[PDB]
CSV table of C-alpha atoms and ligand atoms in Angstrom, one decimal:
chain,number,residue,atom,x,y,z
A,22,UNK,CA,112.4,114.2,138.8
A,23,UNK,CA,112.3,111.0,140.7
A,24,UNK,CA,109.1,110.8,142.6
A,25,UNK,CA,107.0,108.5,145.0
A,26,UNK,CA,105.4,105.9,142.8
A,27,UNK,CA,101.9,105.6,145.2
A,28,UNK,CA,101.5,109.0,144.9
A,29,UNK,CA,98.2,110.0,143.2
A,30,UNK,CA,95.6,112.7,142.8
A,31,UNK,CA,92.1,112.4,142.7
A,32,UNK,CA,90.9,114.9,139.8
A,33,UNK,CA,89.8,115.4,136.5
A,34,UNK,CA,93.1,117.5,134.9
A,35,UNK,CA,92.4,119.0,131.5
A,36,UNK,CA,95.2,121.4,131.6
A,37,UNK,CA,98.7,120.8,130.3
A,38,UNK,CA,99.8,123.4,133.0
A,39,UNK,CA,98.3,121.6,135.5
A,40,UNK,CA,100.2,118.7,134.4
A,41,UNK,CA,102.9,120.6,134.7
A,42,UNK,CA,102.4,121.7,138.2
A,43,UNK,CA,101.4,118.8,139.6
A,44,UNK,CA,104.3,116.2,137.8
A,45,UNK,CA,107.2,117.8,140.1
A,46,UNK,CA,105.4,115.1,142.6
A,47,UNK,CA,103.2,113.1,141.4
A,48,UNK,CA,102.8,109.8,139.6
A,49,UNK,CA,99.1,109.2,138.0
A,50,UNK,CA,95.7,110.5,138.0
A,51,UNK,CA,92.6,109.2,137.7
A,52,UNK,CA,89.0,111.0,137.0
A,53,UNK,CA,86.7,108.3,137.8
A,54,UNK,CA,86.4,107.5,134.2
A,55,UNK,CA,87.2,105.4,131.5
A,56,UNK,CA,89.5,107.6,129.5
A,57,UNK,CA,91.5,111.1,130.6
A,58,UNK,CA,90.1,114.3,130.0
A,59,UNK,CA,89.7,115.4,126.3
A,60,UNK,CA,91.9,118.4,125.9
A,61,UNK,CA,94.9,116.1,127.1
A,62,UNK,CA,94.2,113.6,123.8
A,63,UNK,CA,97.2,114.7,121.5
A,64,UNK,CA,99.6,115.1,124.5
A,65,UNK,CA,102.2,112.4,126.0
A,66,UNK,CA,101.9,113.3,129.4
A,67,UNK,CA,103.4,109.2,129.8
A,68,UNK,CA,106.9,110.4,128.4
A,69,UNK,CA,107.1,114.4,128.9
A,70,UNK,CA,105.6,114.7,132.4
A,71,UNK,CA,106.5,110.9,133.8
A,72,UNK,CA,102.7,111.1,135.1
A,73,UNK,CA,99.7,107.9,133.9
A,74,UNK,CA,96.0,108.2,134.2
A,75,UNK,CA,94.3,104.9,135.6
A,76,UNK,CA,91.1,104.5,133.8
A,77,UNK,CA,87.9,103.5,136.3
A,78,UNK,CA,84.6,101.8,135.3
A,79,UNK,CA,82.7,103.5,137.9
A,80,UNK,CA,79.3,101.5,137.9
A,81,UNK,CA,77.9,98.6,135.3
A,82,UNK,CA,77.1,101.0,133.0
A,83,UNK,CA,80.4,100.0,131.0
A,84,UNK,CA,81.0,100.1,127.0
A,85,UNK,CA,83.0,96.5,127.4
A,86,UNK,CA,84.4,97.2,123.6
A,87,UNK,CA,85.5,100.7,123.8
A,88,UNK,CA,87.3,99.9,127.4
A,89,UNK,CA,89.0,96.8,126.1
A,90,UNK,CA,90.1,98.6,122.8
A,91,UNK,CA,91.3,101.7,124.6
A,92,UNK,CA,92.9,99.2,127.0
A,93,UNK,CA,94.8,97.0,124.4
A,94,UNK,CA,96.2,99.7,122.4
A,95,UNK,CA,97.9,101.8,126.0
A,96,UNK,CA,99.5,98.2,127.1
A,97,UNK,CA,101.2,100.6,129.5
A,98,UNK,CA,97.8,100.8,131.9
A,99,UNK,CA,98.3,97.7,134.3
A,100,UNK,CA,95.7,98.6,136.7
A,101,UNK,CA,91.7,99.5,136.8
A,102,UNK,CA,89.8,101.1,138.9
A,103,UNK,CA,86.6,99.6,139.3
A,104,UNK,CA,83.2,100.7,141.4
A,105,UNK,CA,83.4,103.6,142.8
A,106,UNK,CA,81.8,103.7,146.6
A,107,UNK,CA,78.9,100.6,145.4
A,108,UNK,CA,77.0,101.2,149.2
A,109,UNK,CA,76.7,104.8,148.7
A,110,UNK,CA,73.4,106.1,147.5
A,111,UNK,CA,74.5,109.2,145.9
A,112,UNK,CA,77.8,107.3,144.2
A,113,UNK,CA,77.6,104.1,142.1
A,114,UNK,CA,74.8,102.2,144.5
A,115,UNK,CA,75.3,98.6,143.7
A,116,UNK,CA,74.2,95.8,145.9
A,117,UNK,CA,76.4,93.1,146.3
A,118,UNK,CA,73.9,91.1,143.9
A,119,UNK,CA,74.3,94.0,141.4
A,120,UNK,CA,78.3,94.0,141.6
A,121,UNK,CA,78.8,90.2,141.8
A,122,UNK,CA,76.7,90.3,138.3
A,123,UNK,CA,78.7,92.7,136.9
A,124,UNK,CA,82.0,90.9,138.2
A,125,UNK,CA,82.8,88.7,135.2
A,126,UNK,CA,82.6,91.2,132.9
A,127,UNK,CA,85.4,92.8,134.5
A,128,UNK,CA,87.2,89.6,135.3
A,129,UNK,CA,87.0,88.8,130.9
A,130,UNK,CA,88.6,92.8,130.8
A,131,UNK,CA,91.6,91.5,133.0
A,132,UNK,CA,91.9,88.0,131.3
A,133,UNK,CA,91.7,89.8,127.8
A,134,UNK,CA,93.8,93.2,128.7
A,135,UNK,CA,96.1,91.9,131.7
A,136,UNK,CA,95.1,94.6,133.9
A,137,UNK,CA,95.1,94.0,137.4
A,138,UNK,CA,91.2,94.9,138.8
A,139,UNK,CA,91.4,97.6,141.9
A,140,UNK,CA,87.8,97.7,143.8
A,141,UNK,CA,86.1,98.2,145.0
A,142,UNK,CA,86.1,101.1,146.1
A,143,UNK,CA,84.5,100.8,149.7
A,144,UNK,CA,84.0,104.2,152.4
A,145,UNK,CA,81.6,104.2,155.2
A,146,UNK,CA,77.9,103.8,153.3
A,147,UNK,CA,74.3,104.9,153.3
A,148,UNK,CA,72.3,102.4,151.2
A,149,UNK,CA,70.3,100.5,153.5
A,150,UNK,CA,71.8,97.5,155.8
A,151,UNK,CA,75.3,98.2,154.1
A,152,UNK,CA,76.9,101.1,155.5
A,153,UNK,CA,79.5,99.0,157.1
A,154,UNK,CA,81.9,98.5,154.1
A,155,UNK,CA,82.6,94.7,155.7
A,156,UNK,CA,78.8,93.6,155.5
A,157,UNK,CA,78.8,94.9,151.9
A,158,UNK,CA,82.0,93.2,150.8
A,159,UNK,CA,81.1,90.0,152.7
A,160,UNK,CA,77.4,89.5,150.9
A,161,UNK,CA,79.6,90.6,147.4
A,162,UNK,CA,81.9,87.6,148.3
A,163,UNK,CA,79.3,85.3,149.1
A,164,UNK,CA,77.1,86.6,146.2
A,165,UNK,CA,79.6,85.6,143.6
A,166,UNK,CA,80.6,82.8,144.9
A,167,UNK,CA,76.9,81.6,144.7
A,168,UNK,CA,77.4,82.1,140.5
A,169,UNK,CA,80.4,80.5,140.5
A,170,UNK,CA,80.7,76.9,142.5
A,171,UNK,CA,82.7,78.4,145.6
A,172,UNK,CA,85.2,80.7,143.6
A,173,UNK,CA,86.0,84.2,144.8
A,174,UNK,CA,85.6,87.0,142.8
A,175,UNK,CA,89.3,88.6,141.1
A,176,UNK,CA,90.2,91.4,143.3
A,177,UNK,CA,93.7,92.2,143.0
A,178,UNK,CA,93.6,95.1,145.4
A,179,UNK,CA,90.9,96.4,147.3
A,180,UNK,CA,89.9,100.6,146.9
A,181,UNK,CA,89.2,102.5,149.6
A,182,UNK,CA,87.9,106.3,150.7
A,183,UNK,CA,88.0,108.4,153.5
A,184,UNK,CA,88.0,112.3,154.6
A,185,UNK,CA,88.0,111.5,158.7
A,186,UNK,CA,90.4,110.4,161.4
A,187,UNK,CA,91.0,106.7,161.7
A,188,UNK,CA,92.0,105.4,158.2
A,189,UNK,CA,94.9,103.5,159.4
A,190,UNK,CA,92.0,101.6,162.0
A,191,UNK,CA,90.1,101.2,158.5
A,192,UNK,CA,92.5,99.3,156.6
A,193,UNK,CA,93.2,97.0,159.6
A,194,UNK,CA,89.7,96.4,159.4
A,195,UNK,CA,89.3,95.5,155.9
A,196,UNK,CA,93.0,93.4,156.2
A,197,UNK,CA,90.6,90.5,157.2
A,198,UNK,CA,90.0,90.2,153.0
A,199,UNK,CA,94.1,89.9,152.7
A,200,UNK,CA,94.5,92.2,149.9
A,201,UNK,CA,96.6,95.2,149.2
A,202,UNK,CA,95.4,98.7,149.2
A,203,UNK,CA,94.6,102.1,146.6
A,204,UNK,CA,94.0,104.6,149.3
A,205,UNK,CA,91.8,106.2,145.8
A,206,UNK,CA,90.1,109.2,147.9
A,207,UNK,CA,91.2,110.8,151.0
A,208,UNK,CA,91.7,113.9,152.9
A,209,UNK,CA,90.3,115.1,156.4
A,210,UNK,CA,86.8,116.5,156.5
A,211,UNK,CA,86.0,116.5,160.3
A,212,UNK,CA,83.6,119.0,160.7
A,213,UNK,CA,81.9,118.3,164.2
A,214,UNK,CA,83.0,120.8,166.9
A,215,UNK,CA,84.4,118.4,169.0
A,216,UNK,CA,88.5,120.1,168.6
A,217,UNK,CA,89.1,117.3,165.7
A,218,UNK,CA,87.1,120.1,163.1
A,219,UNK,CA,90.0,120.5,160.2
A,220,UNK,CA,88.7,124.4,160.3
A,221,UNK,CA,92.2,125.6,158.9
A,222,UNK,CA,95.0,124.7,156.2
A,223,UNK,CA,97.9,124.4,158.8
A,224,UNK,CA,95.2,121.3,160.1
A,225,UNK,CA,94.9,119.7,156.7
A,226,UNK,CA,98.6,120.3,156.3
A,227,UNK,CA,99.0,118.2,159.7
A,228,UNK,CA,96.5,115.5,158.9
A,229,UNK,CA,97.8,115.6,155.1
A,230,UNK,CA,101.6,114.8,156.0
A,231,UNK,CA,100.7,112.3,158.7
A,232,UNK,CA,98.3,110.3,156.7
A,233,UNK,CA,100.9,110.5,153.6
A,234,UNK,CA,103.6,109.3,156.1
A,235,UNK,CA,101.9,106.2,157.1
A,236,UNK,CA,100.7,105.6,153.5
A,237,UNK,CA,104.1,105.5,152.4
A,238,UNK,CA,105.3,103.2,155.3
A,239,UNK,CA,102.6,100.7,154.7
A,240,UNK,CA,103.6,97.6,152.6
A,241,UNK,CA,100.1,97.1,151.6
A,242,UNK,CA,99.2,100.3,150.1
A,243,UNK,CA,100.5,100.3,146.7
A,244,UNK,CA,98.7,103.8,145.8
A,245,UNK,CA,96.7,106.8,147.1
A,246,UNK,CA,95.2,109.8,145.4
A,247,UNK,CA,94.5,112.8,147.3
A,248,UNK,CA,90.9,114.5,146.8
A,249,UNK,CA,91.5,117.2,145.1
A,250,UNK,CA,93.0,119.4,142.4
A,251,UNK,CA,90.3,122.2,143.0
A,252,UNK,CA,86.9,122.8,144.9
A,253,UNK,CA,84.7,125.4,145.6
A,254,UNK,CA,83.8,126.4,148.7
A,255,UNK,CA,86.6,124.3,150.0
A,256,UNK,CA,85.7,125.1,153.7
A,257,UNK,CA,88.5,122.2,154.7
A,258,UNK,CA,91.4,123.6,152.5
A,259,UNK,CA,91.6,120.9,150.4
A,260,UNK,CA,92.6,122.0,147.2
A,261,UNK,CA,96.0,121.4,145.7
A,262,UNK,CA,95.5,124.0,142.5
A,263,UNK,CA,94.3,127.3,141.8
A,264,UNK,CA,94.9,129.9,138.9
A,265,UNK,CA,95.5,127.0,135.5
A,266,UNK,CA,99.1,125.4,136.7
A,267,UNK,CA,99.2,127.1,140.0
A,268,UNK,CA,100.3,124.9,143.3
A,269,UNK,CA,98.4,126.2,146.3
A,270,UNK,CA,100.3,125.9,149.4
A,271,UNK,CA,98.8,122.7,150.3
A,272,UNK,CA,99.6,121.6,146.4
A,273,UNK,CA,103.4,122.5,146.8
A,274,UNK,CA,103.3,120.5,150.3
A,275,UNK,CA,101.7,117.7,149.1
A,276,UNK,CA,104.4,117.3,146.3
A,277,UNK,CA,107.5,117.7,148.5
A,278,UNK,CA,106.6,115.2,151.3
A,279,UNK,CA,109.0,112.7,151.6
A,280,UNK,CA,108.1,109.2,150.5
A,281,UNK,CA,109.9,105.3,150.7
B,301,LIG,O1,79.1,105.9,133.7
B,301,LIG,C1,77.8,106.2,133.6
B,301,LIG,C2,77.3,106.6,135.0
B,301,LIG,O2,77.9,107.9,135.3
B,301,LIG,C3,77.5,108.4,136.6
B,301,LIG,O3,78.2,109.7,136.7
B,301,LIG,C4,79.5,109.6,137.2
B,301,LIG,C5,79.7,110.7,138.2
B,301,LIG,O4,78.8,110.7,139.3
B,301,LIG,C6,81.2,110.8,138.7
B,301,LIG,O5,81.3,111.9,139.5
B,301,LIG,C7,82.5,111.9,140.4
B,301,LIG,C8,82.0,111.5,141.8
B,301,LIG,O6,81.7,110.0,141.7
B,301,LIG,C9,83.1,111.7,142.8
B,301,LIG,O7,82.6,111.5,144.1
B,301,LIG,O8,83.5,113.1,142.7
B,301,LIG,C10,84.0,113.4,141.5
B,301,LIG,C11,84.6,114.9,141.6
B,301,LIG,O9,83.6,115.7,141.9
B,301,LIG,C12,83.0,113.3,140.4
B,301,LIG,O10,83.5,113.6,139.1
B,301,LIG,O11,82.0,111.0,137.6
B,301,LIG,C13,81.9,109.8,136.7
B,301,LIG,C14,82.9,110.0,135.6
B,301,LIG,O12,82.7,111.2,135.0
B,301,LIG,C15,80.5,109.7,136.1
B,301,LIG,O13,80.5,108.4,135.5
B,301,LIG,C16,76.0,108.6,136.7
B,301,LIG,O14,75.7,108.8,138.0
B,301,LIG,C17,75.4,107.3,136.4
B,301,LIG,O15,74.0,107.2,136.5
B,301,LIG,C18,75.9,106.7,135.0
B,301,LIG,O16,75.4,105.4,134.9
């Protein structure tokens, strides 16, 4: 089937039949890890279900060897996801000193690999003094450059996350970097009872098809992954799967919305 090449899901699958399911529409999957689920080992999802996994190195706890080998021998993989949400507390909690020192190691990945390096991944943050994602990328910027006589770190696109209204005003924000976009988590959470609550599926339908629309019409979003396959409780309709390689309703939607 042909198929919007952005369009992503953020998940761990481990079914086949969710393959299956999901392929009809979608392009790759990641699992915020460095390799896909186990059960899907002696599959090729690559040529049977026209679907690849992005691998992610989700904080500086990274087994250089094992990436790079995994890496170099799926010459396929052009991109990797790297630090996932580094100002949250409860995600990969790096300070721009802690992320700068890992940088290299992922900058000797890309030189030795050719993948591209996407991250990272930035949302609204709690660790202290960085919860806007702009003061934490800024101090990244200027901590690396410190290491490294002036030079900018390798960021080929910039990751971002978001479950609210306004992520078209985000990315115009974060535009000030000039790089391209993974959208690599979104969906719309609003839970404040202010009439933007998405208390309903027919609202996450709504705020699903217009934030897909203006993914697809941006130039500089060159992917985005929806959160998620499955959740429980999933008090903002969510999920996209339910029985092993059943669509929900919001699944089958998601798949079928038209793309550039
Ligand atoms: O790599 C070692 C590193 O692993 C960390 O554990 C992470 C998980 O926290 C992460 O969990 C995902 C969440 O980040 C995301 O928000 O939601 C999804 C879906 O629920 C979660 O799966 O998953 C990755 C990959 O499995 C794990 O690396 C530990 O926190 C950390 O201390 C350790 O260094």
């Amino acid at each position: 089937a042909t198929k919007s090449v952005k369009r992503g899901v953020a998940y761990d699958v481990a079914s086949p039949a969710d393959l299956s399911a999901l392929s009809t529409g979608m392009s790759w999957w990641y699992n915020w890890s460095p390799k896909p689920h186990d059960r899907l080992a002696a599959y090729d999802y690559a040529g049977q279900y026209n679907v690849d996994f992005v691998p992610m190195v989700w904080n500086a706890n990274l087994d250089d060897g094992q990436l790079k080998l995994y890496l170099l021998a799926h010459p396929g993989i052009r991109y990797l996801l790297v630090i996932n949400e580094p100002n949250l507390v409860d995600q990969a909690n790096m300070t721009p000193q802690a992320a700068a020192q890992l940088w290299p190691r992922l900058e000797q990945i890309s030189a030795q690999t050719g993948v591209k390096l996407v991250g990272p991944a930035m949302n609204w943050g709690t660790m202290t003094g960085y919860g806007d994602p702009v003061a934490w990328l800024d101090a990244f910027y200027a901590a690396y450059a410190s290491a490294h006589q002036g030079r900018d770190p390798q960021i080929d696109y910039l990751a971002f996350h978001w479950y609210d209204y306004g992520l078209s005003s985000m990315l115009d924000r974060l535009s000030r970097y000039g790089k391209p976009f993974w959208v690599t988590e979104f969906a719309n959470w609003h839970t404040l009872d202010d009439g933007l609550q998405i208390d309903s599926l027919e609202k996450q339908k709504q705020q699903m098809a217009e934030m897909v629309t203006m993914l697809e019409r941006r130039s500089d979003v060159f992917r985005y992954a929806w959160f998620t396959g499955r959740m429980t409780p999933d008090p903002h309709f969510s999920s996209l799967l339910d029985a092993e390689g059943r669509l929900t309703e919001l699944g089958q939607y998601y798949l079928s919305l038209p793309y550039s």
